[PDB]
Amino acid sequence: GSSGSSGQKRAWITAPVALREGEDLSKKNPIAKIHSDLAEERGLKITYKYTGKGITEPPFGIFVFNKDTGELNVTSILDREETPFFLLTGYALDARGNNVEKPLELRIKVLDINDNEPVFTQD
């Protein structure tokens, strides 16, 4: 929908992923993807992991990620009833496996079927 049109700066910045439950979200994907620039700059294979509801905690079989491609795709239909919210964290470990750059607080909210979110601006 909107990555980041207006902000303070373009660096290690993330946006609140907003998806509507119901159908299979097998289109928007990838819906998220984080990585260190030093990777493409230098040419190292950075590792990415995700911890939270859907991966480390049930209901299992919700979110899947791979360090080979470095992407996040949903393999299950979201639901406000079962999971009203989804908390996940992104880690950028180096070839060695150390936390060189603090992780990210990726938050994924679940909008109802009739998502009627209000309209406003951020200054």
Coordinates of N, CA, C and O in Angstrom, one line a residue:
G1 N 0.8 -1.2 0.0 CA 0.0 0.0 0.0 C 0.8 1.3 0.0 O 0.7 2.1 -0.9
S2 N 1.7 1.4 1.0 CA 2.5 2.6 1.1 C 3.8 2.3 2.0 O 3.7 2.0 3.2
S3 N 4.9 2.3 1.3 CA 6.2 2.0 2.0 C 6.6 3.2 2.8 O 6.7 3.1 4.1
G4 N 6.9 4.3 2.2 CA 7.4 5.5 2.9 C 7.5 6.7 2.0 O 8.6 6.9 1.4
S5 N 6.4 7.4 1.8 CA 6.4 8.6 0.9 C 7.0 9.8 1.7 O 7.8 10.5 1.1
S6 N 6.5 10.0 2.9 CA 7.0 11.1 3.7 C 7.6 10.6 5.0 O 7.0 9.8 5.7
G7 N 8.8 11.1 5.4 CA 9.4 10.7 6.6 C 10.5 11.7 7.0 O 10.6 12.8 6.5
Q8 N 11.4 11.2 7.9 CA 12.5 12.1 8.4 C 13.8 11.7 7.7 O 14.7 12.5 7.5
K9 N 13.9 10.4 7.3 CA 15.1 9.9 6.6 C 14.9 8.5 6.1 O 14.0 7.8 6.5
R10 N 15.7 8.2 5.1 CA 15.6 6.9 4.5 C 16.8 6.0 4.9 O 17.8 5.9 4.2
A11 N 16.6 5.3 6.1 CA 17.7 4.4 6.6 C 17.1 3.5 7.7 O 16.4 3.9 8.6
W12 N 17.4 2.2 7.5 CA 16.9 1.2 8.5 C 15.5 1.6 9.0 O 15.2 1.5 10.2
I13 N 14.6 2.0 8.1 CA 13.3 2.4 8.5 C 12.3 1.3 8.0 O 12.4 0.8 6.9
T14 N 11.3 1.1 8.8 CA 10.2 0.1 8.4 C 8.8 0.7 8.6 O 8.6 1.6 9.4
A15 N 7.9 0.1 7.9 CA 6.5 0.6 8.0 C 5.6 -0.5 8.5 O 5.8 -1.7 8.4
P16 N 4.5 -0.1 9.2 CA 3.5 -1.0 9.8 C 2.7 -1.7 8.7 O 1.8 -1.2 8.1
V17 N 3.0 -3.0 8.5 CA 2.3 -3.8 7.5 C 0.9 -4.0 7.9 O 0.5 -4.5 8.9
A18 N 0.0 -3.6 7.0 CA -1.5 -3.7 7.2 C -2.1 -4.5 6.1 O -2.2 -4.2 5.0
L19 N -2.6 -5.7 6.6 CA -3.2 -6.6 5.6 C -4.6 -7.0 6.1 O -4.9 -7.0 7.3
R20 N -5.5 -7.3 5.2 CA -6.9 -7.6 5.5 C -7.1 -9.1 5.4 O -6.7 -9.8 4.5
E21 N -7.7 -9.6 6.5 CA -8.0 -11.1 6.6 C -9.1 -11.5 5.6 O -9.8 -10.7 5.1
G22 N -9.2 -12.8 5.4 CA -10.2 -13.3 4.4 C -9.5 -14.2 3.4 O -9.4 -15.4 3.6
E23 N -9.2 -13.6 2.2 CA -8.6 -14.4 1.2 C -7.1 -14.7 1.4 O -6.5 -14.2 2.4
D24 N -6.5 -15.5 0.6 CA -5.1 -15.8 0.7 C -4.2 -14.7 0.2 O -4.2 -14.3 -1.0
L25 N -3.3 -14.2 1.1 CA -2.4 -13.1 0.7 C -1.2 -13.6 -0.1 O -0.1 -13.4 0.3
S26 N -1.5 -14.3 -1.2 CA -0.4 -14.9 -2.0 C -0.2 -14.0 -3.2 O 0.2 -14.5 -4.3
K27 N -0.4 -12.7 -3.0 CA -0.1 -11.8 -4.1 C 0.8 -10.6 -3.7 O 1.9 -10.4 -4.3
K28 N 0.4 -9.9 -2.7 CA 1.2 -8.8 -2.1 C 2.6 -9.2 -1.9 O 3.6 -8.5 -2.2
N29 N 2.8 -10.4 -1.4 CA 4.1 -11.0 -1.2 C 5.1 -10.6 -2.3 O 4.7 -10.7 -3.5
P30 N 6.3 -10.3 -2.0 CA 6.8 -10.2 -0.6 C 6.2 -9.0 0.2 O 6.0 -7.9 -0.4
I31 N 5.8 -9.3 1.4 CA 5.2 -8.3 2.2 C 6.2 -7.6 3.2 O 5.9 -6.7 3.9
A32 N 7.4 -8.2 3.1 CA 8.5 -7.6 4.0 C 9.8 -8.2 3.6 O 9.9 -9.4 3.1
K33 N 10.9 -7.5 3.9 CA 12.2 -8.0 3.6 C 13.3 -7.0 4.1 O 13.3 -5.8 3.7
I34 N 14.1 -7.5 5.0 CA 15.2 -6.6 5.6 C 16.5 -7.2 5.4 O 16.7 -8.4 5.3
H35 N 17.5 -6.4 5.3 CA 18.9 -6.8 5.0 C 19.9 -5.7 5.1 O 19.5 -4.5 5.0
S36 N 21.2 -6.0 5.4 CA 22.2 -4.9 5.5 C 22.8 -4.6 4.1 O 23.0 -5.5 3.3
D37 N 23.0 -3.3 3.9 CA 23.6 -2.9 2.6 C 25.0 -3.5 2.4 O 25.3 -3.9 1.3
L38 N 25.8 -3.5 3.5 CA 27.1 -4.0 3.4 C 27.2 -5.3 2.6 O 28.2 -5.7 2.1
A39 N 26.0 -6.0 2.6 CA 26.0 -7.3 1.8 C 26.2 -7.1 0.4 O 27.2 -7.6 -0.2
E40 N 25.4 -6.3 -0.3 CA 25.6 -6.0 -1.7 C 26.8 -5.2 -2.0 O 27.5 -5.3 -3.0
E41 N 27.1 -4.3 -1.0 CA 28.3 -3.4 -1.2 C 29.6 -4.2 -1.2 O 30.4 -4.2 -2.1
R42 N 29.8 -5.0 -0.1 CA 30.9 -5.9 0.0 C 30.8 -7.2 -0.7 O 31.6 -7.6 -1.5
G43 N 29.6 -7.9 -0.5 CA 29.4 -9.1 -1.2 C 29.3 -10.3 -0.2 O 29.6 -11.4 -0.6
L44 N 28.9 -10.0 1.0 CA 28.8 -11.0 2.1 C 27.3 -11.6 2.1 O 26.4 -10.9 1.8
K45 N 27.2 -12.8 2.6 CA 25.9 -13.4 2.8 C 25.3 -13.2 4.2 O 25.6 -14.0 5.1
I46 N 24.6 -12.1 4.3 CA 24.0 -11.8 5.6 C 22.8 -12.8 6.0 O 22.1 -13.3 5.1
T47 N 22.7 -13.1 7.2 CA 21.6 -14.0 7.7 C 20.5 -13.3 8.3 O 20.7 -12.3 9.1
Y48 N 19.2 -13.7 8.0 CA 18.0 -13.0 8.5 C 17.1 -14.1 9.2 O 16.8 -15.1 8.6
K49 N 16.7 -13.7 10.4 CA 15.8 -14.6 11.2 C 14.6 -13.8 11.7 O 14.7 -12.6 11.9
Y50 N 13.5 -14.6 12.0 CA 12.3 -13.9 12.5 C 11.8 -14.7 13.7 O 11.7 -15.9 13.7
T51 N 11.5 -14.0 14.8 CA 11.0 -14.6 16.0 C 9.7 -14.0 16.5 O 9.6 -12.7 16.6
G52 N 8.7 -14.8 16.8 CA 7.4 -14.2 17.2 C 6.2 -15.1 16.9 O 6.4 -16.3 16.6
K53 N 5.0 -14.6 17.0 CA 3.8 -15.4 16.8 C 3.8 -15.8 15.3 O 3.8 -15.0 14.4
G54 N 3.7 -17.1 15.1 CA 3.6 -17.6 13.7 C 4.8 -18.5 13.4 O 4.8 -19.3 12.5
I55 N 6.0 -18.2 14.0 CA 7.2 -18.9 13.8 C 7.7 -19.7 15.0 O 7.8 -20.9 14.9
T56 N 7.9 -18.9 16.1 CA 8.3 -19.6 17.3 C 7.1 -20.0 18.2 O 7.2 -20.9 19.0
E57 N 6.0 -19.3 18.0 CA 4.8 -19.6 18.7 C 3.6 -19.9 17.8 O 3.5 -19.4 16.7
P58 N 2.7 -20.8 18.2 CA 1.5 -21.1 17.4 C 0.5 -20.0 17.3 O 0.6 -19.0 18.0
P59 N -0.5 -20.1 16.4 CA -0.6 -21.4 15.6 C 0.5 -21.5 14.5 O 0.7 -20.6 13.7
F60 N 1.2 -22.6 14.6 CA 2.2 -22.9 13.6 C 1.7 -22.9 12.2 O 0.5 -23.0 11.9
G61 N 2.6 -22.7 11.2 CA 2.3 -22.6 9.8 C 1.6 -21.4 9.5 O 0.4 -21.4 9.0
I62 N 2.3 -20.2 9.6 CA 1.7 -18.9 9.3 C 2.7 -18.1 8.4 O 2.3 -17.7 7.3
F63 N 3.9 -17.9 9.0 CA 4.9 -17.1 8.2 C 6.1 -18.0 8.0 O 6.6 -18.7 8.9
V64 N 6.7 -17.9 6.8 CA 7.9 -18.6 6.4 C 8.9 -17.7 5.8 O 8.6 -16.9 5.0
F65 N 10.2 -17.9 6.2 CA 11.3 -17.1 5.7 C 12.5 -18.0 5.4 O 12.7 -19.1 6.0
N66 N 13.4 -17.6 4.5 CA 14.6 -18.3 4.1 C 15.8 -17.4 4.0 O 15.7 -16.3 3.5
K67 N 16.9 -17.8 4.6 CA 18.1 -17.0 4.5 C 18.8 -17.1 3.1 O 19.7 -16.4 2.8
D68 N 18.3 -18.1 2.3 CA 18.9 -18.3 1.0 C 18.4 -17.2 0.0 O 19.1 -16.7 -0.9
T69 N 17.1 -16.8 0.2 CA 16.5 -15.7 -0.6 C 16.3 -14.4 0.2 O 16.3 -13.4 -0.4
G70 N 16.2 -14.5 1.5 CA 16.0 -13.4 2.3 C 14.7 -12.7 2.0 O 14.7 -11.5 1.6
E71 N 13.6 -13.4 2.2 CA 12.2 -12.8 2.0 C 11.2 -13.4 2.9 O 11.4 -14.4 3.6
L72 N 10.1 -12.7 3.1 CA 9.0 -13.1 4.0 C 7.7 -13.2 3.2 O 7.2 -12.2 2.7
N73 N 7.1 -14.4 3.2 CA 5.9 -14.7 2.5 C 4.9 -15.4 3.4 O 5.3 -16.3 4.1
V74 N 3.6 -15.0 3.3 CA 2.6 -15.6 4.2 C 2.0 -16.8 3.5 O 1.7 -16.8 2.3
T75 N 1.8 -17.9 4.2 CA 1.3 -19.1 3.7 C 0.0 -19.5 4.4 O -0.3 -20.7 4.5
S76 N -0.7 -18.5 4.9 CA -1.9 -18.8 5.7 C -2.8 -17.5 5.7 O -2.3 -16.4 5.7
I77 N -4.1 -17.7 5.7 CA -5.0 -16.5 5.7 C -5.2 -16.0 7.1 O -5.5 -16.7 8.1
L78 N -4.8 -14.7 7.2 CA -4.9 -14.0 8.5 C -6.3 -14.0 9.1 O -7.2 -14.3 8.4
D79 N -6.4 -13.7 10.4 CA -7.7 -13.6 11.0 C -7.7 -12.9 12.3 O -6.8 -13.1 13.2
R80 N -8.6 -11.9 12.5 CA -8.6 -11.1 13.7 C -9.1 -11.9 14.9 O -8.8 -11.6 16.0
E81 N -10.0 -12.9 14.6 CA -10.5 -13.7 15.6 C -9.5 -14.6 16.3 O -9.3 -14.5 17.5
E82 N -8.7 -15.3 15.5 CA -7.6 -16.2 16.1 C -6.4 -15.3 16.5 O -6.0 -15.3 17.6
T83 N -5.9 -14.6 15.5 CA -4.7 -13.7 15.7 C -5.0 -12.3 15.3 O -4.9 -11.9 14.2
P84 N -5.4 -11.5 16.3 CA -5.8 -10.1 16.1 C -4.5 -9.2 15.8 O -4.6 -8.1 15.3
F85 N -3.4 -9.8 16.2 CA -2.1 -9.1 16.0 C -1.0 -10.0 15.8 O -1.0 -11.2 16.2
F86 N 0.1 -9.6 15.1 CA 1.3 -10.4 14.8 C 2.6 -9.7 15.2 O 2.9 -8.7 14.5
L87 N 3.2 -10.2 16.2 CA 4.5 -9.5 16.6 C 5.7 -10.3 16.1 O 5.8 -11.5 16.4
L88 N 6.6 -9.7 15.4 CA 7.8 -10.3 14.8 C 9.0 -9.4 15.0 O 8.9 -8.2 15.1
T89 N 10.2 -10.0 14.9 CA 11.4 -9.3 15.1 C 12.4 -9.7 14.0 O 12.5 -10.9 13.7
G90 N 13.2 -8.7 13.5 CA 14.1 -9.0 12.4 C 15.6 -8.9 12.9 O 15.9 -7.8 13.5
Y91 N 16.4 -9.9 12.7 CA 17.8 -9.8 13.1 C 18.7 -9.9 11.9 O 18.5 -10.6 11.0
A92 N 19.8 -9.0 11.9 CA 20.7 -9.0 10.9 C 22.1 -9.5 11.3 O 23.0 -8.7 11.6
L93 N 22.3 -10.8 11.4 CA 23.5 -11.4 11.8 C 24.5 -11.5 10.7 O 24.1 -11.8 9.5
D94 N 25.8 -11.3 10.9 CA 26.8 -11.4 9.9 C 27.2 -12.8 9.7 O 26.8 -13.7 10.4
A95 N 28.1 -13.0 8.7 CA 28.6 -14.3 8.3 C 28.9 -15.1 9.6 O 28.8 -16.3 9.6
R96 N 29.5 -14.4 10.6 CA 29.9 -15.0 11.8 C 28.7 -15.4 12.7 O 28.6 -16.5 13.3
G97 N 27.6 -14.6 12.7 CA 26.4 -14.8 13.4 C 26.3 -13.9 14.7 O 25.8 -14.4 15.7
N98 N 26.8 -12.7 14.6 CA 26.7 -11.8 15.7 C 25.8 -10.6 15.4 O 25.7 -10.2 14.2
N99 N 25.2 -10.1 16.4 CA 24.3 -9.0 16.2 C 25.0 -7.6 16.0 O 25.2 -6.9 17.0
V100 N 25.4 -7.4 14.8 CA 26.1 -6.1 14.5 C 25.2 -4.9 14.5 O 25.6 -3.8 14.9
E101 N 24.0 -5.1 14.0 CA 23.0 -4.0 14.0 C 21.7 -4.5 14.7 O 21.0 -5.4 14.2
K102 N 21.3 -3.8 15.7 CA 20.1 -4.1 16.5 C 19.0 -4.5 15.5 O 18.9 -4.0 14.4
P103 N 18.1 -5.4 16.0 CA 17.0 -5.9 15.2 C 15.9 -4.9 14.9 O 16.1 -3.7 15.3
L104 N 14.8 -5.3 14.4 CA 13.7 -4.4 14.1 C 12.4 -4.9 14.7 O 12.2 -6.1 14.8
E105 N 11.5 -4.0 15.2 CA 10.3 -4.3 15.8 C 9.2 -4.3 14.8 O 8.2 -3.5 14.8
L106 N 9.3 -5.2 13.8 CA 8.3 -5.4 12.7 C 6.9 -5.7 13.3 O 6.7 -6.8 13.9
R107 N 5.9 -4.8 13.2 CA 4.6 -5.1 13.7 C 3.6 -5.2 12.6 O 3.5 -4.4 11.7
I108 N 2.8 -6.3 12.6 CA 1.8 -6.6 11.6 C 0.4 -6.6 12.2 O 0.0 -7.6 12.9
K109 N -0.4 -5.6 11.9 CA -1.7 -5.5 12.4 C -2.7 -6.2 11.5 O -2.5 -6.2 10.2
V110 N -3.8 -6.7 12.0 CA -4.8 -7.4 11.2 C -6.1 -6.6 11.1 O -6.8 -6.4 12.1
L111 N -6.4 -6.1 10.0 CA -7.6 -5.3 9.8 C -8.8 -6.2 9.5 O -8.7 -7.2 8.9
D112 N -10.0 -5.7 10.0 CA -11.2 -6.5 9.8 C -11.6 -6.6 8.3 O -10.9 -6.0 7.5
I113 N -12.6 -7.4 8.0 CA -13.1 -7.5 6.6 C -13.6 -6.2 6.1 O -13.4 -6.0 4.9
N114 N -14.2 -5.4 6.9 CA -14.7 -4.1 6.5 C -13.8 -3.0 6.9 O -14.3 -1.9 7.4
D115 N -12.5 -3.2 6.9 CA -11.5 -2.2 7.3 C -11.9 -0.8 6.8 O -11.9 -0.5 5.6
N116 N -12.3 0.1 7.8 CA -12.8 1.4 7.5 C -11.9 2.4 8.2 O -12.3 3.5 8.6
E117 N -10.6 2.1 8.3 CA -9.6 3.0 8.9 C -9.9 4.5 8.5 O -10.2 4.8 7.4
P118 N -9.7 5.4 9.5 CA -9.9 6.8 9.2 C -8.8 7.4 8.3 O -7.8 6.8 8.0
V119 N -9.0 8.7 7.9 CA -8.1 9.3 7.0 C -7.4 10.5 7.7 O -8.1 11.4 8.3
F120 N -6.1 10.6 7.7 CA -5.4 11.7 8.3 C -4.0 11.8 7.7 O -3.6 11.1 6.8
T121 N -3.2 12.8 8.3 CA -1.8 13.0 7.8 C -0.9 13.0 9.0 O -1.3 13.2 10.1
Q122 N 0.4 12.8 8.7 CA 1.4 12.8 9.7 C 2.5 13.9 9.4 O 3.2 13.9 8.4
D123 N 2.6 14.9 10.3 CA 3.6 15.9 10.2 C 4.6 15.9 11.3 O 4.4 15.3 12.3

